[PDB]
Ligand binder design. Structure first.
Ligand code: HEM
Length: 291
């Protein structure tokens, strides 16, 4: 399939900065969600789940079509808990009804990362809603009860290499697992609504114990109260992933640069940008605007 980006009619940078600002102001306002984590992490997870359905082999799924709005994908068991992110974005979409669903879900993730003090993520507009019959089937998102070989093979379908995989997984600095959503419980670290390289530091520095949670699933726990999924821990079991974990644990700037590239790529997979499409936009944070 070919999905050509088409700019929302007449819109330019200033329009999308206004959407960014509305998301960012609501992140500030709705700060109590999930015991004062706020909505930043769930919006990043939503951006990953809506883009992470992509299949490079046939260009199905991905961010372009905005198909999470349809029942089949909305009710994917892998998407449990993401309804909170969708409901957050509802009043944004009502204020800016011209933005496509795919542009909104992906911009939500960009805004959340930046407003949580993460790297700038260049972002391109022009995803176009596609009909219900284009919704990918359930089962395209990854399982957490797996090893490094599973992780590596899984991410090949998204055209991600080892460095891109390890960089993307650093988003697990954010938020937490919730037993009723995923069968896992606990946060990955302490500063879980600020985007940092703490995921890699915790992997390397904590004393992890393989325990069973209350859903009878194995997860790695530390005495500080942190947790890692089996797939997270696989990044220090595999020697190639381990080298990259060590790199990002020792170089915050390199992690930010590599995450920004990999996250933009994730959100753009499947999309053909015409020769005369606008350049990627770099949005100012509220702090940078004095707002
Ligand atoms: C092997 C790959 C991955 C697996 C197996 C995985 C699995 C999970 C699981 C089980 C949860 C807990 C959901 C819940 O209980 O609420 C979670 C949360 C989360 N995921 Fe991942 N994930 C992966 C990769 C990614 C990537 C690539 C990103 C973004 C770049 C991401 C972003 C997040 C965020 C931010 C949260 C926290 C959400 C919240 O606090 O509500 N994940 N993931």
């Amino acid at each position: 399939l070919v999905h050509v980006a088409s700019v929302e009619k007449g819109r330019s940078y200033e329009d999308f900065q206004k959407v960014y600002n509305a998301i960012a102001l609501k992140l500030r306002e709705d700060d109590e969600y999930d015991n004062y984590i706020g909505y930043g992490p769930v919006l990043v997870r939503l951006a990953w789940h809506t883009s992470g359905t992509w299949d490079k082999h046939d260009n199905t799924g991905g961010s372009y079509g905005g198909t999470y709005r349809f029942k089949k994908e909305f009710n994917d068991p892998s998407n449990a808990g993401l309804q909170n992110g969708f409901k957050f974005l509802e009043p944004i979409h009502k204020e800016f009804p011209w933005i496509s669903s795919g542009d909104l879900f992906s911009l939500g993730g960009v805004t959340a990362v930046q407003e949580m003090q993460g790297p700038k993520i260049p972002w391109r507009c022009g995803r176009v809603d596609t009909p219900e019959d284009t919704t990918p089937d359930n089962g395209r998102l990854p399982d957490a009860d797996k090893d490094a070989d599973y992780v590596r093979t899984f991410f090949q379908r998204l055209n991600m290499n080892d460095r891109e995989v390890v960089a993307l997984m650093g988003a697990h600095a954010l938020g937490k697992t919730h037993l009723k959503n995923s069968g896992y419980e606990g946060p990955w670290g302490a500063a879980n609504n600020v985007f940092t390289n703490e995921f890699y530091l915790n992997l390397l520095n904590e004393d992890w114990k393989l325990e069973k949670n209350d859903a009878n699933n194995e997860q790695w726990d530390s005495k500080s109260g942190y947790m890692m999924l089996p797939t997270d821990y696989s990044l220090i079991q595999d020697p190639k992933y381990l080298s990259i974990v060590k790199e990002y644990a020792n170089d915050q700037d390199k992690f930010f640069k590599d995450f920004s590239k990999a996250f933009e790529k994730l959100l753009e997979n499947g999309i053909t940008f015409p020769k005369d499409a606008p350049s990627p936009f770099i949005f100012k944070t509220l702090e940078e605007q004095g707002l």
